[PDB]
Amino acid sequence: ATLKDQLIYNLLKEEQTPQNKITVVGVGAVGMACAISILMKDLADELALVDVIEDKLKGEMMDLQHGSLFLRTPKIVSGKDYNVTANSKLVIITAGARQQEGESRLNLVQRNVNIFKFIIPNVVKYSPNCKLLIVSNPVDILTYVAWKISGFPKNRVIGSGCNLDSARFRYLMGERLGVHPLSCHGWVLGEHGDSSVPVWSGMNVAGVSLKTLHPDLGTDKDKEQWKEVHKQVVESAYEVIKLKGYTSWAIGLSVADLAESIMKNLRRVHPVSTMIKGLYGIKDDVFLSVPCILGQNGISDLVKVTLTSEEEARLKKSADTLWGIQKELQF
Amino acid sequence: ATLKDQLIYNLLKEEQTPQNKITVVGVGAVGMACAISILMKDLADELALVDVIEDKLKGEMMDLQHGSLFLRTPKIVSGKDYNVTANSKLVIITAGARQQEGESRLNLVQRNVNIFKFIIPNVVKYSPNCKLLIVSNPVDILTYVAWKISGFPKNRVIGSGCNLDSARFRYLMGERLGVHPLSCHGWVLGEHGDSSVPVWSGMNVAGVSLKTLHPDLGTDKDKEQWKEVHKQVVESAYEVIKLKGYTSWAIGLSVADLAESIMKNLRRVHPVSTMIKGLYGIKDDVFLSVPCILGQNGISDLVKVTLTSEEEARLKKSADTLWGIQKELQF
Amino acid sequence: ATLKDQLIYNLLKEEQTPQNKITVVGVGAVGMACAISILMKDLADELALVDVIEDKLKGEMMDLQHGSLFLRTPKIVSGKDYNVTANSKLVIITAGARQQEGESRLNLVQRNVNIFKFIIPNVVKYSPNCKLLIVSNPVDILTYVAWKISGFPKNRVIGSGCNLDSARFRYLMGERLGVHPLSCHGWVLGEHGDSSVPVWSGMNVAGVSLKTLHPDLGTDKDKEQWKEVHKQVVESAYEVIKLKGYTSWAIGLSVADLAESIMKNLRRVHPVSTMIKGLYGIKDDVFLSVPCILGQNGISDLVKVTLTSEEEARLKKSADTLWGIQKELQF
Amino acid sequence: ATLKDQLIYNLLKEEQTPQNKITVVGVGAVGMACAISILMKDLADELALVDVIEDKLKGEMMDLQHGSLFLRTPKIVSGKDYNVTANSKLVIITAGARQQEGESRLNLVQRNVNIFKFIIPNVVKYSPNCKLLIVSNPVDILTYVAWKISGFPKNRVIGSGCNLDSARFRYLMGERLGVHPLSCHGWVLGEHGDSSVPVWSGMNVAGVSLKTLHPDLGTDKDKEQWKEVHKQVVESAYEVIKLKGYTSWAIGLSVADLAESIMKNLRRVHPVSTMIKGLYGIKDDVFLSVPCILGQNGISDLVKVTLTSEEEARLKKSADTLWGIQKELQF
Ligand SMILES: NC(=O)C1=CN([C@@H]2O[C@H](COP(=O)(O)OP(=O)(O)OC[C@H]3O[C@@H](n4cnc5c(N)ncnc54)[C@H](O)[C@@H]3O)[C@@H](O)[C@H]2O)C=CC1
Ligand SMILES: NC(=O)C1=CN([C@@H]2O[C@H](COP(=O)(O)OP(=O)(O)OC[C@H]3O[C@@H](n4cnc5c(N)ncnc54)[C@H](O)[C@@H]3O)[C@@H](O)[C@H]2O)C=CC1
Ligand SMILES: NC(=O)C1=CN([C@@H]2O[C@H](COP(=O)(O)OP(=O)(O)OC[C@H]3O[C@@H](n4cnc5c(N)ncnc54)[C@H](O)[C@@H]3O)[C@@H](O)[C@H]2O)C=CC1
Numbered sequence A, B, C, D: 001a002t003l004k005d006q007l008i009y010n011l012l013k014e015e016q017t018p019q020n021k022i023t024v025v026g027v028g029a030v031g032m033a034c035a036i037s038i039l040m041k042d043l044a045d046e047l048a049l050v051d052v053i054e055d056k057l058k059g060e061m062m063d064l065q066h067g068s069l070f071l072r073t074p075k076i077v078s079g080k081d082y083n084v085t086a087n088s089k090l091v092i093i094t095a096g097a098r099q100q101e102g103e104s105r106l107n108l109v110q111r112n113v114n115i116f117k118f119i120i121p122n123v124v125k126y127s128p129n130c131k132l133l134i135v136s137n138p139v140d141i142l143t144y145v146a147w148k149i150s151g152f153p154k155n156r157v158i159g160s161g162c163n164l165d166s167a168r169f170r171y172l173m174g175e176r177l178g179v180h181p182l183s184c185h186g187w188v189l190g191e192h193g194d195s196s197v198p199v200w201s202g203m204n205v206a207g208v209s210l211k212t213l214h215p216d217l218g219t220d221k222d223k224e225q226w227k228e229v230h231k232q233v234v235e236s237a238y239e240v241i242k243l244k245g246y247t248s249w250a251i252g253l254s255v256a257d258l259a260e261s262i263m264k265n266l267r268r269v270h271p272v273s274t275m276i277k278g279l280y281g282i283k284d285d286v287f288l289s290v291p292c293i294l295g296q297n298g299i300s301d302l303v304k305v306t307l308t309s310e311e312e313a314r315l316k317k318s319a320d321t322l323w324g325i326q327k328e329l330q331f
């Protein structure tokens, strides 16, 4: 008899069957920040990692495993084969190609489409009932791509979208007011990053409309230049990329926040990218961030924000530019 | 009036003072993993980061700040000047040089000594009552270096030591037994890494001694080769380094574990590197890991583990080796 | 030698000092729910309990101590003597008399004033720098009582106020909308309980004003009867009291929420009872709930909510009523 | 269109299907302490409460619901009908009769059996795949009763047993040593309370056997009287009952600890009561606490503690007395 059998009497030859499993595909800085954030929030009973770089993948898995004593996620697995991902409730895509020096980031779209053409069918093959959370950029385009390839209904395909943009907005708003971002409310909608739309009518503390207090809010003649808050939502992201080479910690925390609502069926409202055709005169299949109710079935509902004519037109124009690029992608 | 003053009536304008502050020096992978782990465990109400690479430092700080919505640590600061670190309760040193190709371990440690000669006096100036937690390698030697440079009493100078090695031991033990590492008990003592000592007499589940169940435990005669568990404690560290280039997540969690005991005054027992002169025939100023009680004053007590003659001789040999290196360091 | 000295070598024998200490005075259902909530949220490194019923006090203390394995608050103490409370950062007052059958509300408050005349001077003696959080009812009147007895500056005397009423409001709002209360925003201000004021202009999801969507919101004309949401804020409290005899769990969580902002210096915004003289035509020393910024110094700022004429008149009428009662209290 | 439909566009008519549901039956002080502890540890996505006292049940449910803002458990339900319990992963039984003044607690056994004859078939009817965790006293007898009535395999019927007794043991051990109970290891096995067995051979800090350090450990001639540690495991429970009337907080934390391992599939080792026939010469169907591995299938394995002849005989005698009473219960 082995020492294990000397010490331990077994009652059950059990079905190792995962109940609250999450997969992260792509273990770059973003994927691993999502992983550590999910692990430290105790959201999964099993975590699977997938990548194409085999040594890096195994090393990251082992590094996490060596911390198991300090975690409450008892099973961490990895592999290039998607059988390690079977029966995931939630599959997070952070995979992408490396932009080469000098080239334009427009070259990355089709490269990442080709990556998704390999990833997404394998995800579906092993977790046909999962929710897909897309993080890879350009995220609104790639969420549409993931939706198309997966065949999933739109409630189960979620783009991380403007959840991070809105977190940055509330951070910068809190800095100006001396109030924790949790008590500073404001919504950035539409496309992630450059073209996002700040909804000035919704910016408030304790239910007090800042736009009503300060009618110049969000205009160019605002002597306090609150529009700079949204400008810095975009430019601070480019600044972090310039300063440290990439961003990782805030998106990792953002993604774990989305995973928390999904895994725990919270029905909190998050600005994530969803298939928005049938709103705002948008007549094309495109994904844009609006406030969505997130839970165990993905996006079950969304909030219809009342928009100014200018805000609505910006969303329509974003839909047009998304549709224009999408019709030139090769599936 | 400003929008802020329209919205908010100020009662107090008093110089806010830091209450439960941690500093991390060095924002490579290890420092940032310590940072994110401390942040996600809510161990500090203020986090300061220091490095000599100014752009990387600012970018990491901003990245964390952008996740403020998702955290409960309201102040995150950074700078190359140590005034940002003033009044830390705990200062975590992860700074070090990059060992160059063909650079000897002896030349490398001296370069880290020269780094500590700049860091530690500056830390002491602005937080003279802090606890020092030394992570940089060689960690046991550099804990001695920090102790000698700081002038601190020995209770307030702690090497992360074998807390990580023991976590790896318990992970590997749990893998063999099918039990969570939290319930698998076993202690790795002495030097971090290469020369660490597994204390087979303490390995147990539910208080059942594995050595008494299986007297070959820890010997080469053991048909089940349980010595491989300790061999993998050392080799798996080198394997992660080979596979992903460095280690970060497990040491980050290990450091947060130590920080939790110190910041919350828990008086849990951890194997950390402490001044061991007076034990095991060691008469030199050497730091090695033994089980220590950790709380608000650093190391207040240590456990006197009953060691075999062979185990004691390995600690004494380690102390001899460490002192031989330390007495040739240029301070 | 003793077993303890065989096992443990002591380095430091120094008077341990309290670092992040909370006291709860009064260990009825409300005090103990505050206690367990603070313990399970890891808000304090020392918890002191005080009451005049000595056996009940010791039994509650011991019961918590027996769960120490499952907590991270290493010191739990109690006594009728206030030396056990020395150096608390936050002192939570839940003490009060049992209203007798046929005893008037005016006779009852005077009995709680006489209780506060013994409690508050003793608290101040041993923690002169603490923040006072008053929970006992009538909470707004007794916050004034504690302020006048303590001599504390107004920033350090806080009534739990309408944080609980607003939580009930958001729960009931979330039930109607199918959204988690965390994402349902609405503020109940003024007096706790009976005479509280719902601020319909601030009720929103994702920054979308419900009053602007549904102009009948808050009126008797409203076919959807949203005023019933605020009516249930008051009536559901009385219903719980009728059904289980008292309320405890929600106020315990509400108090822990306030304690979290104070202990961690979060500067989140909470509707708590604060000195309101100078607003809304109120010239008397009266405490009512408005949104306040809570941190390490108590209430540092308050938000000036834009109120309708009717809302402002209700706050002014409340202040008139409270002052009429307070000026007849015997100190 | 209602305000809800004006604000929110619905994507999914969804199956409200519970994924991580827990039920507590009996909402006395113990049941509600288990409930609040489970809620504050975020273990369930749905909590159901059952009792026969209808007003108390509704009041406790409402009090919890009013705290929803401060929790992450989005659905709290209650009822006397067990359809509210459908599809629970884990069902915790804390129901029991009130001992009348003067009568012997032996009269309670059959009264609580009769209670279980109503409860357990209804639990099975609506959650035929759940794990049953029995807390009601006498817990080892009633765990056997629940096992018999339910028809479940023994891995899915768990008595809270000596998990609490062992937590008290480690608390008292920590008090003597000045070490947090988390670092003080020691096991109390067998029957809950009066007849429990302290396993002195397993008592250790950092793997250091206290019995080997101090061979009088656990004997009557021990000049330091460490046997008093186990005496106080029993007597401190009776003391709390005398002082406050009952115990609740420590058992609530104990039960949440067991629920954590079960719901998160941790495979930690806990001393819980399990059907032990086939060990220690025990030839009868009886439940006694031994160290069990707990996870998503309940008790999957148990540790075979090496026992002295006296320890083994105490467990055999306990089995005999359990069997003697059980054969006089009426099912
Ligand atoms: N939506 C948002 O708010 C944010 C999104 N991101 C995006 O996250 C993505 C990843 O960011 P980083 O980690 O910094 O990039 P990275 O390039 O370092 O990591 C990408 C990983 O994907 C792996 N990969 C490539 N092809 C793969 C394939 N078929 N299958 C599996 N794995 C594959 C790669 O080997 C790599 O390890 C980027 O697209 C980035 O723009 C980053 C921050 C904010
Ligand atoms: N004790 C343990 O268990 C473990 C310790 N380590 C050690 O952690 C240390 C850091 O590891 P990595 O982050 O991977 O290396 P890294 O080289 O990427 O980071 C070191 C950082 O220290 C900075 N630095 C150099 N001189 C400085 C000075 N005067 N002041 C402030 N910052 C300075 C550097 O700019 C660098 O950003 C290494 O020595 C490593 O061996 C790594 C894992 C396990
Ligand atoms: N502000 C809010 O939102 C809410 C406040 N409360 C109030 O909390 C207070 C306590 O509620 P319960 O625990 O249910 O009542 P309780 O009567 O059971 O507990 C009050 C405790 O105060 C003790 N006491 C009396 N005089 C004392 C003195 N000098 N010093 C120390 N302790 C003393 C009493 O022995 C008692 O144990 C009540 O006034 C209640 O109305 C209750 C829930 C909501």
Ligand SMILES: NC(=O)C1=CN([C@@H]2O[C@H](COP(=O)(O)OP(=O)(O)OC[C@H]3O[C@@H](n4cnc5c(N)ncnc54)[C@H](O)[C@@H]3O)[C@@H](O)[C@H]2O)C=CC1
Pocket (backbone or CB within 6 Å): D025, D026, D027, D028, D029, D030, D031, D050, D051, D052, D053, D094, D095, D096, D097, D098, D115, D116, D118, D119, D134, D135, D136, D137, D138, D139, D160, D161, D164, D192, D246, D247, D248, D251
């Ligand atoms: N195993 C352990 O370590 C510990 C176990 N306990 C035991 O917990 C049990 C409950 O303790 P308390 O809450 O203080 O007692 P309690 O008598 O106040 O609560 C029992 C509840 O069960 C309800 N009840 C009675 N019959 C019922 C039925 N058919 N169906 C549903 N509910 C029913 C009762 O109405 C009552 O609300 C007791 O047996 C106690 O000995 C208490 C502490 C330690």
Ligand SMILES: NS(=O)(=O)c1ccc(Cc2c(-c3cccc(-c4ccccc4)c3)nn(-c3nc(C(=O)O)cs3)c2CC2CC2)cc1
Pocket (backbone or CB within 6 Å): A105, A106, A108, A109, A137, A138, A139, A140, A141, A142, A164, A191, A192, A193, A194, A234, A237, A238, A241, A246, A247, A251, A322, A325
């Ligand atoms: N609506 S969309 O058309 O899908 C969409 C449009 C635009 C972006 C910008 C972008 C990209 C990115 C990378 C590679 C290719 C393209 C690309 C290619 C073709 C056409 C359009 C865009 C975009 N990366 N990126 C990052 N953001 C972070 C962060 O930390 O926020 C870190 S990199 C950001 C947000 C910027 C930092 C604030 C993204 C998406």
Ligand SMILES: NS(=O)(=O)c1ccc(Cc2c(-c3cccc(-c4ccccc4)c3)nn(-c3nc(C(=O)O)cs3)c2CC2CC2)cc1
Pocket (backbone or CB within 6 Å): B099, B105, B106, B108, B109, B137, B138, B139, B140, B141, B142, B164, B191, B192, B193, B194, B234, B237, B238, B241, B246, B247, B251, B322, B325
């Ligand atoms: N007792 S000592 O003399 O202080 C002491 C002795 C030996 C070590 C080894 C070591 C080093 C290291 C790097 C550079 C120089 C020296 C050095 C310089 C002079 C003299 C001796 C050694 C040591 N780095 N390193 C790491 N470990 C990890 C991990 O993840 O564990 C990641 S890098 C480890 C632990 C090994 C991987 C498991 C460490 C300390």
Ligand SMILES: NS(=O)(=O)c1ccc(Cc2c(-c3cccc(-c4ccccc4)c3)nn(-c3nc(C(=O)O)cs3)c2CC2CC2)cc1
Pocket (backbone or CB within 6 Å): C099, C105, C106, C108, C109, C137, C138, C139, C140, C141, C142, C164, C191, C192, C193, C194, C234, C237, C238, C241, C246, C247, C251, C322, C325
């Ligand atoms: N603005 S004020 O003048 O301070 C102020 C005015 C009125 C109240 C009502 C009240 C009392 C209470 C008890 C005893 C005496 C007095 C009293 C004495 C003198 C003068 C006026 C009132 C008030 N108790 N009480 C509770 N609420 C809960 C809960 O769970 O909410 C549980 S008991 C509530 C809130 C009600 C249930 C919703 C409270 C405060």
Ligand SMILES: NS(=O)(=O)c1ccc(Cc2c(-c3cccc(-c4ccccc4)c3)nn(-c3nc(C(=O)O)cs3)c2CC2CC2)cc1
Pocket (backbone or CB within 6 Å): D105, D106, D108, D109, D137, D138, D139, D140, D141, D142, D164, D191, D192, D193, D194, D234, D237, D238, D241, D246, D247, D251, D322, D325
């Ligand atoms: N092995 S057994 O035969 O099942 C078994 C045997 C003995 C007990 C004792 C007991 C009871 C209890 C209540 C009612 C009836 C019987 C009873 C009836 C017939 C025959 C035997 C016992 C026992 N209640 N009780 C509590 N403990 C706590 C705590 O906080 O620990 C709070 S009440 C305790 C533990 C004591 C405080 C430390 C329990 C079980």
